[PDB]
Write a protein that binds this ligand. Structure first.
Ligand SMILES: CCc1oc2c(Cl)ccc(Cl)c2c1C(=O)c1cc(I)c(O)c(I)c1
Ligand SMILES: CCc1oc2c(Cl)ccc(Cl)c2c1C(=O)c1cc(I)c(O)c(I)c1
Lengths: 115, 115, 115, 115
């Protein structure tokens, strides 16, 4: 699993469950081609988005539907979505975890890139 | 000033100076139209992007060029940019401060919205 | 003003108003001695804690009463308080802004240090 | 495992390895009794601190030696340590993960409390 996403909820102190997201890959014409998508599990995680073979170098965008998450909780959110845009680069075997910690008016995001 | 941005550096504990950013507004045809742009000052702040009359209701995107910031400091960061996308002025005019705290592999972002 | 604190609310997207905090300084006997205290204003800021002459080198602790903040909003938060402990003025006098962004189960804290 | 700690590094985008920490429990005389300690693994995690039987309600402090971590990396840090102080409360079976994301001049911390 070369690319995984983890989402946590800073209001409830829990995994953010059933958070939908779409992953896009930047095309030569600078448009965002849909690449993969899913919803987070009960652990706030989304696995199995891509494979080693297809996860080639390039610019990728993860668009996390945080607005729908907060709306389902009855809490007014600020952002339309949380977007994480990064370049994936071949420097040895790399596994990427994109993590986001969500609050209604704020979010934090980090990457855990390992071998 | 109804739309201001502030950027801090979490490595040096300082304002993030000379950070370029572009603001877009979603058009009726669903494309992102250019709205305003600028760079942060010595205080890490960017003021004067718009006016109360021009800053109508809509969905706005602030694209903060964090990559160029880190690269000029010798650092190859994870993110291509920090994106902040939000609906503004849906309940009447408000003043928005978009803030981002930057590290090479992570950033946090929040908003301060006043009436 | 060499020591200022700013506190924001990540749920409401606003300053965190009326947040009490106590500042301590580590004594030569290694106990925490009271140094200054106050509460945040309508802007979420606390100024006037000390002076350049009084704010000598040393290890300082800012104890931010986040629990009382959340409880007054009806929320039972995770943390008892937010603690920020740092050495100040070790290379000569500096100006410090201690910032905290609060959510019920999470907070971020940073420092802005200027010469 | 009722209490676990996870530490990540926002400069290198990796688990924070070999980070030492001590856990304290508040005593009746308001002093901090040493309770448990350890160093994070290659995954940035510390398990096996306590057991269900001894992890009773009370106020607990996790003191994370972030200063030694950054010093070992040759990077000048702001904080003496990162402290996380919380009340553990019996509301059904609860597992606590205390997580911290570290930068030299800033850190974020959250709790993931589950059943
Ligand atoms: C969404 C995950 C996450 O994102 C963070 C950001 Cl962005 C800032 C600070 C923190 Cl602490 C976190 C954080 C975690 O708490 C976390 C991470 C992993 I990997 C994990 O297995 C568990 I359990 C918890
Ligand atoms: C409490 C202030 C604060 O703390 C943060 C943390 Cl800890 C992480 C990320 C962010 Cl973006 C912030 C943040 C701000 O938004 C901020 C800071 C300053 I100085 C400021 O003048 C204004 I306006 C806004």
């Amino acid at each position: 699993c070369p690319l995984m996403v983890k989402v946590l909820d800073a209001v409830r102190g829990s995994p953010a469950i059933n958070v939908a997201m779409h992953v896009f890959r930047k095309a030569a014409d600078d448009t965002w081609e849909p690449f993969a998508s899913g919803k987070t599990s009960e652990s706030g995680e989304l696995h199995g988005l891509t494979t080693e073979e297809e996860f080639v170098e390039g610019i990728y965008k993860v668009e996390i539907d945080t607005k729908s998450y907060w709306k389902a909780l009855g809490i007014s959110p600020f952002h339309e979505h949380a977007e994480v845009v990064f370049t994936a680069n071949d420097s040895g075997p790399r596994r990427y975890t994109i993590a986001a910690l969500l609050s209604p008016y704020s979010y934090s995001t980090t990457a855990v890139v390992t071998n």
